[PDB]
Amino acid sequence: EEGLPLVGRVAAGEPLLAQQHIEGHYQVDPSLFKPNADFLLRVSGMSMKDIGIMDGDLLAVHKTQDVRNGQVVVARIDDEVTVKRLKKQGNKVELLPENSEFKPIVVDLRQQSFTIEGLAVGVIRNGDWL
Amino acid sequence: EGLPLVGRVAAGEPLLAQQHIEGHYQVDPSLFKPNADFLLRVSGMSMKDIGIMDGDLLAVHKTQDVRNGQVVVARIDDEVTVKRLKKQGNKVELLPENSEFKPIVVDLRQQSFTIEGLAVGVIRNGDWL
Amino acid sequence: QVQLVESGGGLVQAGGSLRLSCAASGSIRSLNAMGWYRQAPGKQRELVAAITSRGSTRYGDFVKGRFTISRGNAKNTVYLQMNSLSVEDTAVYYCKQTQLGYDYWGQGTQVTVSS
Amino acid sequence: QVQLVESGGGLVQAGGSLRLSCAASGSIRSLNAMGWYRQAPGKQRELVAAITSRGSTRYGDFVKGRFTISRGNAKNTVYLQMNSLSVEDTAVYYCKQTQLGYDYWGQGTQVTVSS
């Protein structure tokens, strides 16, 4: 209980950094990421492989809403966590995939609730170590 | 003290020469199976198709016991390369995971070839200062 | 070569708790990991908890905060504090160690949580 | 509000040593990084050395073993020891601090190498 917390499946209606979502603590220096990583979020699917983010990868996330246009963010669209490249246009924000197989998500803040969970600051790829 | 960073390796100099260490990273080595011994900065996009982008720090377990299909660190005539090992017979090949790169054939009669170790994952962290 | 000695299983009434422990004899590298998988009759073997010699920890995705793995003041000994157990947690709980990429199993310790 | 105070530097002949000191002050987060970049006339701003609040360290690819970055018993102060200096190490060495993803820079320290 002393290192970076590891988040996997996120229930809907429950915060991401909820203790019931936390399934480990990895002893990895935070400041090795810039901004520093606050937690590791296991990535789902292949939407960001073109930048080397694969299913199973632990995305080192800085918890913040301080995210510029162009950066890769962790976002929550109607309770759903997604890791995409950001391009925010007033309250029509476009989340972009890094995989020409997927289409870019437009999310109307008039239609869905949208939260920026934090900035993507790296990945760790370790798999099963026991 | 933690895991050593290893950038480019000068020809004739060994890999883990203190001259080549560009840092120590505080990362639990037993978070990799088998455990990480050093992080090697990957150079180029030959392995992009499994997520190993150019610039990544590949976690590496120091060993020569490498099975085929495994992704390894190899030195072909003083040239460190990360590729997938195809041992199948008296035959051993270095396979990329990038359609624009051809397989590399290792003939131990033409080239000096050492298995530097096993890749047990990557750390993509970039510049932190 | 490593020798793994389980203790602490048995029957528990749902909502109750029970602690498992493992001790690893033999040639133990400084760097290693230990913990528990588990196996319900019929299903496959699942990761429960794991812990490195250096303190890092991982839990299976059913644990949901409920369990806690820790290494003891003892050397090469971990305990798994299982709390809030559910009948669906009834399984055979094998202890596990790797070092250098080779695995080592325990004999198994059965845990029956009853309705 | 992070102010960074530099110290050290100078003119040393090749094969020699110089120490570099940077004292950070103000609103330091416990998680941060400190080091030095350098910029020589006609060249780009290169990373020289760097160290996190927790001891993770990184060196520029020309360092090749020659410099050590230390943290010390003071607080938020980083030491850089620069052995075997070359006339290619001559440059203005700027202190840098990053926390919460922002950059804090020093005024620079002159390091020049003769023969």
Looking at the domain assignment, is residue C23 inside a domain? yes
Q: How many degrees, rounded to 5, is the angle at CA B3 between CA B1 and CA B7? A: 125
D74: left (phi over 0), alpha (psi -120 to 50) or beta: beta
Catalytic residue numbers of A?
A: 47, 84
Catalytic residue numbers of B?
A: 46, 83
Number of independent structural domains in chain C? 1
Q: Which helix (H) or strand (E) holds A46?
A: none
A38 touches chain D (CB under 8 A): no
Of A28, A29, A52, the CB nearest to B56: A52
Of B30, B52, B126, the CB nearest to A129: B30
CB contact under 8 A, B33 and A121: no
Domain with C57 in it = 2-110
CB contact under 8 A, D33 and A29: no
B90 touches chain C (CB under 8 A): no
Rounded to the nearest angstrom, the minimum Cα separation between A58 and chain B is: 10
D touches which chains (3+ CB pairs under 8 A)? Answer: A, B
| Whether the Cβ atoms of residue A16 and residue A61 lie closer than 8 Å to each other | no
Give the pairing of strands D109-114 and D10-13: parallel
Which residues, in sequence order, are bridge partners of residue D19? D81
Question: DSSP characters for C14-83?
Answer: TT--EEEEEEEEE---SS-EEEEEEE-TTS-EEEEEEEETTS-EEE-TT-TT-EEEEE-SSTTEEEEEE-
| Whether the Cβ atoms of residue A74 and residue A120 lie closer than 8 Å to each other | yes
Which residue has 């603590």 as its token pair?
A25
Say how far apart CA D48 and CA D38 lie, in whole Å. 6
CA distances from D22 to D6, D65, D91 (A): 4, 21, 17
Do D and A make contact via 3 or more CB pairs under 8 A? The reply is yes
CB count in 10 Å sphere of residue A64: 17
Which residues have CB under 8 Å from B47's CB, separation 6+? B71, B82, B83, B84, B96, B97, B98
Exposure string (b/e) for D42-78, b if CB count within 10 Å is 16 or more? eeeeebbbbbbbbbbbbbbeebbebbebebeeeebbb
> Which residues in chain C are contacts of A20 at CB distance < 8 A?
64-65
Say how far apart CA C62 and CA C64 lie, in whole Å. 6
Say how far apart CA A66 and CA A116 lie, in whole Å. 9
- Which of B120, B111, B29, B31 is closest to B82 using CA atoms? B120
- Which of C77, C86, C65 is closest to C106 using CA atoms? C77
Helix (H, G, I), strand (E, B) or coil at B31: helix
Q: What method did the depositors use to determine the structure?
A: X-ray
- Which of C25, C10, C29, C33 is closest to C85 using CA atoms? C10
Name the CATH architecture for the domain at B3-123. Answer: Ribbon (2.10)
A18 touches chain D (CB under 8 A): no
At residue C114, φ and ψ (nearest 5 deg) are -105, 155
Question: DSSP characters for chain D?
Answer: -EEEEEEE-EEEETT--EEEEEEEEES--SS-EEEEEEE-TTS--EEEEEEETTS-EEE-TTTTT-EEEE--SSSSEEEEEE-S--TTS-EEEEEEEEETTEEEE---EEEEEE-
Integer-rounded Cα Rg, in Å, for chain A is 14
> Which residues in chain B are contacts of C24 at CB distance < 8 A?
none
Q: How big, in percent rounded to 5, are the helix, strand and coil portions of chain A?
A: 5, 45, 50
Selecting from 2.40.420.20, 2.90.10.10, 2.10.109.10, 3.30.70.980, what CATH number does the domain A4-124 have?
Answer: 2.10.109.10
CATH number of residue C106's parent domain: 2.60.40.10
Token pair for B87: 């041992």
Rounded to the nearest angstrom, the minimum Cα separation between B32 and chain C is: 9
- Which of B117, B126, A40 is closest to C57 using CA atoms? A40
Helix (H, G, I), strand (E, B) or coil at A19: coil
Identify the DSSP state of A37.
P
Cα dihedral A87, A91, A92, A97 sign: positive
Strand ranges, E, within B1-129: 3-6, 21-25, 38-41, 57-61, 71-76, 80-87, 92-95, 104-105, 113-124
Say how far apart CA A24 and CA C68 lie, in whole Å. 10
